[PDB]
Every structure is written in C-alpha cells, then in structure tokens.
Amino acid sequence: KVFGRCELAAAMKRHGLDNYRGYSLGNWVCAAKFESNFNTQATNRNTDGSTDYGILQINSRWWCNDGRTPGSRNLCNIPCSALLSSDITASVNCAKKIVSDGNGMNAWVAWRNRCKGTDVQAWIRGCRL
Numbered sequence: 001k002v003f004g005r006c007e008l009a010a011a012m013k014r015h016g017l018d019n020y021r022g023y024s025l026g027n028w029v030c031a032a033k034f035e036s037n038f039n040t041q042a043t044n045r046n047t048d049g050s051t052d053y054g055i056l057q058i059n060s061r062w063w064c065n066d067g068r069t070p071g072s073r074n075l076c077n078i079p080c081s082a083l084l085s086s087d088i089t090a091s092v093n094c095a096k097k098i099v100s101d102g103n104g105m106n107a108w109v110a111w112r113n114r115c116k117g118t119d120v121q122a123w124i125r126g127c128r129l
C-alpha cells in the first residue's frame with residue numbers, strides 16, 4: 001500500500017502519535033515520507049545483512065526479527081513480516097518503542113537529514129484532520 005499524505009496523517013493521529021514524546025504529527029508524516037514515501041511494502045537490505053522494513057523503515061537488527069540477521073536483537077518483539085502489513089499498527093507500536101529510548105526520532109536518519117529542524121507542520125497542512 002502507498003498511503004496518501006493525509007490518509008497517513010489521519011491514520012497516525014488516530015494512532016496517538018500526535019506529540020508523542022514531544023514529536024508533533026508533522027514529524028511522523030515527514031519521516032514516513034522520506035523513509036519510504038508512504039509505502040508499507042518498502043524494504044532495504046544493507047550490506048551488513050540487516051534490513052529496513054515497513055513504512056518507517058524499522059531496522060532488522062535492534063527492533064524486529066526476520067530470522068536472517070546474525071545480530072540480532074528483537075526489542076519491539078515482532079516479526080518484521082508484520083511490519084510490512086497494510087495496517088500500520090505494528091510499525092506504530094514499534095516506533096513508539098523506539099522514539100521512547102532517548103535518541104528520539106533521530107533513530108530514523110531520513111527524518112534527521114530532511115525533516116529535523118524544518119516547519120514540519122506543512123506535512124499535516126491541508127489535511128482535513
């Protein structure tokens with residue numbers, strides 16, 4: 001599934017992500033946009049064998065379990081196969097798990113190099129939320 005911008009914004013606000021640990025909805029919208037462009041199926045396998053999964057590109061080394069990473073922690077307790085669902089609930093719960101660690105949304109490098117420090121509202125702008 002390739003979410004619409006505010007289809008995903010509404011799905012994230014109905015998931016309680018608005019201002020979760022200090023990060024307004026614009027942060028999450030923009031982070032998803034620049035991690036996978038609103039794609040739940042997206043996947044990226046990086047030379048160490050770990051793999052970024054889902055709409056938030058959660059890595060398969062700390063957070064999920066795919067059974068083919070030699071690391072390999074499963075801190076969200078989840079098969080990455082559930083992070084590739086149409087429903088974003090698994091990814092949202094694991095992301096609340098991650099963002100509550102003290103690194104914050106700096107755990108997602110795309111949000112850090114494109115979103116962090118911007119007027120992120122413009123992502124939930126015109127949303128009809």
Ligand SMILES: [Cl-]
Nearest residue numbers: 034110113114
């Ligand atoms: Cl980038």
